[PDB]
Design a protein around this motif. Structure first.
Motif, PDB file in Angstrom:
ATOM      1  N   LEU A 111       0.837  -1.187   0.000  1.00  0.00           N
ATOM      2  CA  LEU A 111       0.000   0.000   0.000  1.00  0.00           C
ATOM      3  C   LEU A 111       0.878   1.244   0.000  1.00  0.00           C
ATOM      4  O   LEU A 111       2.044   1.211   0.401  1.00  0.00           O
ATOM      5  N   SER A 112       0.296   2.352  -0.454  1.00  0.00           N
ATOM      6  CA  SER A 112       0.985   3.630  -0.481  1.00  0.00           C
ATOM      7  C   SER A 112       0.003   4.718  -0.068  1.00  0.00           C
ATOM      8  O   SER A 112      -1.182   4.457   0.162  1.00  0.00           O
ATOM      9  N   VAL A 113       0.496   5.951   0.003  1.00  0.00           N
ATOM     10  CA  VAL A 113      -0.303   7.100   0.408  1.00  0.00           C
ATOM     11  C   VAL A 113      -0.552   7.975  -0.812  1.00  0.00           C
ATOM     12  O   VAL A 113       0.374   8.260  -1.582  1.00  0.00           O
ATOM     13  N   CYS A 114      -1.807   8.367  -1.011  1.00  0.00           N
ATOM     14  CA  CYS A 114      -2.121   9.342  -2.042  1.00  0.00           C
ATOM     15  C   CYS A 114      -1.520  10.693  -1.670  1.00  0.00           C
ATOM     16  O   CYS A 114      -1.443  11.060  -0.494  1.00  0.00           O
ATOM     17  N   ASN A 170      -8.235  -2.870   1.566  1.00  0.00           N
ATOM     18  CA  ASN A 170      -7.714  -3.059   0.215  1.00  0.00           C
ATOM     19  C   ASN A 170      -7.305  -4.506  -0.040  1.00  0.00           C
ATOM     20  O   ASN A 170      -6.402  -4.766  -0.840  1.00  0.00           O
ATOM     21  N   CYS A 220      -6.478   6.034  -6.889  1.00  0.00           N
ATOM     22  CA  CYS A 220      -7.074   6.101  -5.561  1.00  0.00           C
ATOM     23  C   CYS A 220      -8.589   6.249  -5.699  1.00  0.00           C
ATOM     24  O   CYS A 220      -9.151   6.175  -6.795  1.00  0.00           O
ATOM     25  N   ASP A 277      -3.492   0.892  10.869  1.00  0.00           N
ATOM     26  CA  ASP A 277      -2.879   0.000   9.891  1.00  0.00           C
ATOM     27  C   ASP A 277      -3.760  -1.209   9.596  1.00  0.00           C
ATOM     28  O   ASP A 277      -3.845  -1.647   8.443  1.00  0.00           O
ATOM     29  N   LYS A 307      -5.405   8.894   1.997  1.00  0.00           N
ATOM     30  CA  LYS A 307      -5.826   7.530   2.284  1.00  0.00           C
ATOM     31  C   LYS A 307      -4.885   6.525   1.631  1.00  0.00           C
ATOM     32  O   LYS A 307      -4.274   6.791   0.592  1.00  0.00           O
ATOM     33  N   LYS A 308      -4.771   5.355   2.255  1.00  0.00           N
ATOM     34  CA  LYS A 308      -3.916   4.303   1.727  1.00  0.00           C
ATOM     35  C   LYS A 308      -4.575   3.642   0.527  1.00  0.00           C
ATOM     36  O   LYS A 308      -5.758   3.290   0.568  1.00  0.00           O
ATOM     37  N   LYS A 309      -3.806   3.480  -0.543  1.00  0.00           N
ATOM     38  CA  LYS A 309      -4.259   2.775  -1.732  1.00  0.00           C
ATOM     39  C   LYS A 309      -3.190   1.776  -2.152  1.00  0.00           C
ATOM     40  O   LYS A 309      -1.991   2.020  -1.988  1.00  0.00           O
ATOM     41  N   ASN A 313      -6.468   0.106   7.356  1.00  0.00           N
ATOM     42  CA  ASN A 313      -5.902   0.374   6.040  1.00  0.00           C
ATOM     43  C   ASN A 313      -5.602  -0.911   5.273  1.00  0.00           C
ATOM     44  O   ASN A 313      -5.856  -0.996   4.066  1.00  0.00           O
ATOM     45  N   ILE A 314      -5.055  -1.919   5.957  1.00  0.00           N
ATOM     46  CA  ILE A 314      -4.740  -3.194   5.313  1.00  0.00           C
ATOM     47  C   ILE A 314      -6.000  -3.937   4.885  1.00  0.00           C
ATOM     48  O   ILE A 314      -6.079  -4.450   3.762  1.00  0.00           O
TER      49      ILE A 314
END
Ligand SMILES: [Mg+2]
Ligand SMILES: [Mg+2]
Ligand SMILES: [Mg+2]
Ligand SMILES: [Mg+2]
Ligand SMILES: [Mg+2]
Ligand SMILES: [Mg+2]
Ligand SMILES: [Mg+2]
Ligand SMILES: [Mg+2]
Ligand SMILES: [Mg+2]
Ligand SMILES: [Mg+2]
Ligand SMILES: [Mg+2]
Ligand SMILES: [Mg+2]
Ligand SMILES: [Mg+2]
Ligand SMILES: [Mg+2]
Ligand SMILES: [Mg+2]
Ligand SMILES: [Mg+2]
Ligand SMILES: [Mg+2]
Ligand SMILES: [Mg+2]
Ligand SMILES: [Mg+2]
Ligand SMILES: [Mg+2]
Ligand SMILES: [Mg+2]
Ligand SMILES: [Mg+2]
Ligand SMILES: [Mg+2]
Ligand SMILES: [Mg+2]
Ligand SMILES: [Zn+2]
Lengths: 95, 30, 111, 36, 47, 56, 142
Positions: free
Chosen positions: F26-29, G38, F42, G31, F34-36, G34-35
């Motif tokens: 995952l990464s940050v926009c 997705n 995103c 986390d 938000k994490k995508k 977030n995990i």
RNA sequence: GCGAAACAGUACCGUGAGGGAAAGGUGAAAAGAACCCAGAGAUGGGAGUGAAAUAGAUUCUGAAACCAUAUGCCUACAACG
RNA sequence: UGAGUAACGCUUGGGAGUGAGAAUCUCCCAAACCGAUUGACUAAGGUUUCCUGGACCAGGGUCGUCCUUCCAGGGUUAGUC
């Protein structure tokens, strides 16, 4: 004569569609053992205007409340469609 | 006006919405 | 005849309420119960329901009503006696009116 | 609002459970593996 | 393919109906036994 | 072919030892935070500095 | 101090749910959210709702900080099954078992929560032994 | 225990004669959980009633097989009723 | 346990919309098959499976806001068939 062959009038969209436009058609439920002549005679002795013609419907019983813990059948209905002459419209309630 | 307000939903036994009778809406649901 | 009727004064002889005075408003003979006002106050958690002309409001919060009580726990209350006490009743038939009347057995008080 | 059920019978989770008659009318036949 | 049971109102009622069963001594014996077992469906006449 | 001997409850887990899952990268926009999952657009339709799709 | 949330009769299988629960146990709140948001699995948009409800009733009902929550234990116990008859070939039949899981997620703020559980068990074992010893002097007393 | 403690010769099987089940227990009293939080909702977590809510309608007690979690120990040159 | 294995039983793409959630629901544009038929009327049989609105416990070999499933209401008019 005894007038037990006129149980209850019924009012639906089809009934109200007919009950407009010159000749009115009133739909009642009648004794399933009664005949057309008996229906006309009952209408004669309790309303006073001779029907132009009478049509009859028999609604077959079908399963109702299916899936419910105790299922039950429907009730046998005979429908009668009285049609009064041109220009006459009597009230089903109020005598 | 008022009869317009009293014709929305409130379905009568043998009917649906929309074609509610223009004059008969005060008998069953009075 | 009946031990308890609708209207006569009654008290409770067992339970949390001891010496609980009230008036019987109604008697269920089949279930051997008796509703007595002021005693056994329960507060049903009143929901909200709107499907009727009256149900459109149906304002119900913490209504406290009356719970039925077993007829065995009830005892008739004496009033004519100067010193009121709890006792049992008879079913004497007075020939004056030929009608059955309850009379206490620790005194001579009618009803 | 107007969310209520004043009818004596009303439920959304209708009670039902499927049963099994264990119908296993299975059979078999002969074969070409006969050592006579 | 043509299975064993090919439904028909007339054939069913004339073979296993009440009037067919009430025409012979054997049928009377069968109905008394079915009454003894208190079968709700006495014959094929009733649904 | 059918098992002539039952497999215990331990050999089953030994075979399942390779069934574990992996956490996707995952990464940050850079415009909404938000994490995508990496290398993908995103939820805002914002990939890098390019307005891709209309906002959710 | 364990807060928890539960869900009975979850449609997902415990076997196919434990694979996702093992990806979140011991993980921090943000986390883990977030995990799990997705991951292309069916049992990911349902564990998320349970997790969110657990966060809500941890920082609202039990009154915890909210920046110390870690997934203490997320498991999918075996739920009740439903038996149906699948029609096979040549007149046979088999039994399909739609399997269900009882999901429960638990988060704590203290990273030493196992110690208290062992401590209560140790306290429980000791009460049994003390009763035996208390019974023995009384036996000797008579 | 009568096949049948429940609406059982029922559901169901067979063209038919005929064959033929399973399923009981909340709490003294519904007092059956108002209200708040998350969620679309069911639901869950609090609150409240109750002596007890790990008695909550999945409703007396709840065994084993079975499935998971964890304190401690052991295990990746090893031929094992 | 086999084992999350075999299997899921002849038919595509996109745009817009609903919805908390859409390869699967609605509309539109195409596309592909049937066309002595997958077209239309009926006999027999089936017995409400027909129409409207709502729902997604259960069933749909996935999903589902959708269904021939469920709920509520309605529907079959003869002197000539
Ligand atoms: Mg006719
Ligand atoms: Mg294991
Ligand atoms: Mg594997
Ligand atoms: Mg077959
Ligand atoms: Mg609780
Ligand atoms: Mg129990
Ligand atoms: Mg070694
Ligand atoms: Mg070596
Ligand atoms: Mg050797
Ligand atoms: Mg050795
Ligand atoms: Mg087996
Ligand atoms: Mg397996
Ligand atoms: Mg294999
Ligand atoms: Mg393979
Ligand atoms: Mg395959
Ligand atoms: Mg297919
Ligand atoms: Mg395809
Ligand atoms: Mg062609
Ligand atoms: Mg055709
Ligand atoms: Mg049906
Ligand atoms: Mg339809
Ligand atoms: Mg619909
Ligand atoms: Mg499905
Ligand atoms: Mg004509
Ligand atoms: Zn973004």
């Amino acid at each position: 004569d005894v007038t037990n062959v006129l149980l209850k009038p019924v009012l639906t969209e089809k009934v109200y569609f007919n009950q407009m436009g010159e000749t009115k058609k009133y739909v009642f439920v009648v004794n399933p053992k009664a005949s057309k002549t008996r229906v006309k005679l009952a209408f004669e002795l309790v309303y006073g205007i001779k029907p132009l013609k009478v049509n009859t419907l028999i609604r077959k019983p079908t399963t109702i409340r299916g899936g419910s813990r105790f299922p039950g059948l429907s009730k046998l209905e005979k429908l009668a469609v009285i049609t009064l002459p041109k220009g006459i419209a009597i009230s089903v309630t109020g005598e | 006006k008022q009869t317009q307000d009293l014709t929305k939903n409130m379905k009568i036994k043998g009917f649906r919405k929309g074609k509610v009778p223009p004059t008969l809406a005060k008998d069953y649901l009075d | 005849m009946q031990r308890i009727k609708k209207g006569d004064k009654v008290v409770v002889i067992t339970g949390k309420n001891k010496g609980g005075s009230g008036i019987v408003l109604k008697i269920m003979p089949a279930r051997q119960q008796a509703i007595v006002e002021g005693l056994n106050k329960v507060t049903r958690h009143k929901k909200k329901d709107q499907t009727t002309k009256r149900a459109a409001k149906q304002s119900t919060g913490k209504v406290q009503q009356e719970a039925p009580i077993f007829l065995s726990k009830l005892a008739l209350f004496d009033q004519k006696a100067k010193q009121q006490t709890i006792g049992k009743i008879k079913y004497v038939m007075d020939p004056k009116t030929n009608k059955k009347t309850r009379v206490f057995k620790k005194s001579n008080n009618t009803l | 609002x107007x969310x209520x059920x004043x009818x004596x019978x009303x439920x959304x989770x209708x009670x039902x459970x499927x049963x099994x008659x264990x119908x296993x009318x299975x059979x078999x036949x002969x074969x070409x593996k006969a050592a006579d | 393919m043509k299975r064993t049971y090919q439904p028909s109102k007339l054939k069913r009622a004339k073979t296993h109906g009440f009037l067919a069963r009430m025409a012979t001594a054997s049928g009377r014996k069968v109905l008394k036994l079915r009454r003894k077992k208190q079968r709700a469906q006495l014959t094929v006449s009733s649904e | 072919a059918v098992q002539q001997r039952r497999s215990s409850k331990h050999r089953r887990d030994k075979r399942r030892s390779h069934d574990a899952l992996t956490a996707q990268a995952l990464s940050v926009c850079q415009k909404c935070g938000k994490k995508k999952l990496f290398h993908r657009v995103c939820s805002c339709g914002m990939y890098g500095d390019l307005r891709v799709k209309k906002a959710y | 101090m364990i807060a928890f949330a539960k869900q009975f009769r979850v449609r997902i299988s415990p076997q196919k749910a434990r694979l996702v629960c093992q990806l979140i146990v011991g993980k921090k709140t943000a986390d883990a959210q977030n995990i799990l948001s997705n991951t292309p699995k069916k049992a990911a948009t349902l564990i998320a709702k349970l997790l969110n409800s657990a966060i809500a009733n941890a920082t609202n009902n039990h009154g915890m900080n909210g920046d110390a929550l870690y997934v203490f234990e997320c498991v999918a116990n075996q739920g009740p099954s439903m038996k149906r008859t699948i029609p096979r070939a040549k007149g046979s039949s088999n039994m399909i078992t739609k399997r269900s899981s009882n999901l429960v997620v638990k988060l704590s703020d203290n990273p030493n929560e196992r110690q208290e559980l062992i401590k209560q068990q140790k306290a429980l074992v000791k009460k049994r032994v003390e009763g035996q010893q208390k019974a023995k002097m009384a036996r000797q007393k008579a």
